[PDB]
């Protein structure tokens, strides 16, 4: 009956709620790029470009009684705008499957939506860490002015410290300090659990040490957690949309419009 037409929404309220719940929970339990970046806010689908700051040029303040001394104003070094990309993934549902879910009262399948959400979340993490090259986007792993630090010995008693403490002192020597957030590759984050060194590294930091599968074999970062240091412009959040019944097979698509803007590149350190 329903498929004998072209309708705007091939799903009822409860089915749509379940569809959104699945994608949201998959994003919650899969996203790690959101665990090292603060967010600018829900700007809206209309917003497609945001100003890029690049606060690489700073000057010290003045010390005067009358406040007539000249200090260069802190502002964008070169006013630039970056268009917000969109991350999307498509999945198809069979009209007979919706019919079976409705009539038989069996729960509707949203496992394809879960898979699409997982792929979209992995792609978001990949974009956040390793910036896209064709679109000219920089990432935390690859950015100019990054304060590269050698890790070398990691399998010693305090290998984690030979890189973490050096990174912390380098970031502090640049004026960037405070609650640190540390990310390691799964290999390093696993091998560093040898003798409780994870607790010492967490004591060194303040926001914690996470693991991201998108990182390479032996790589990691330590970053300042300030919204001033780094931000995540959110044009529109992870959501599910309908693409119109092509041949009565209903296609849907998970969507997410995010952009990583690094205001101060010195707040990031790569334990290369």
């Amino acid at each position: 009956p329903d498929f004998l037409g072209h309708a705007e929404n091939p799903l009822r309220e409860e089915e749509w709620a379940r569809l959104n719940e699945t994608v949201i929970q998959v994003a919650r339990r899969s996203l790690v790029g959101r665990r090292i970046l603060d967010i600018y806010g829900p700007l809206g689908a209309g917003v497609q470009t945001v100003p890029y700051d690049e606060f690489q040029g700073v000057s010290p303040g003045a010390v005067d009684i009358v406040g007539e001394q000249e200090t260069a104003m802190v502002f964008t070094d070169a006013r630039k705008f970056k268009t917000i990309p969109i991350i999307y993934k498509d999945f198809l549902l069979h009209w007979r499957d919706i019919e079976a879910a409705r009539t038989h009262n069996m729960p509707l399948d949203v496992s394809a939506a879960a898979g699409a959400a997982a792929l979209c979340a992995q792609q978001e993490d990949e974009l956040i860490f390793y910036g896209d090259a064709r679109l000219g986007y920089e990432g935390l792993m690859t950015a100019n002015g990054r304060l590269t630090v050698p890790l070398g010995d990691w399998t010693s008693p305090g290998g984690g410290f030979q890189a973490i403490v050096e990174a912390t002192r380098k970031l502090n020597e640049q004026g960037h300090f405070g609650p640190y957030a540390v990310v390691l590759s799964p290999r390093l984050y696993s091998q560093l659990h040898r003798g409780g060194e994870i607790e010492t590294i967490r004591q060194l930091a303040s926001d914690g040490v996470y693991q991201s599968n998108r990182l390479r074999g032996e790589s990691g970062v330590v970053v300042s957690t300030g919204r001033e240091n780094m931000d995540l412009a959110v044009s529109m959040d992870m959501v599910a949309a309908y693409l119109g019944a092509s041949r009565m097979n209903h296609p849907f698509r998970v969507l997410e419009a995010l952009l990583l803007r690094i205001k101060h590149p010195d707040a990031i350190c790569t334990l290369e």
Partner: peptide, 10 residues
């Protein structure tokens, strides 16, 4: 109003 489906985890 427009909202944030997957909020900031940090």
């Amino acid at each position: 109003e427009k909202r944030l489906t997957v909020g900031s985890l940090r």
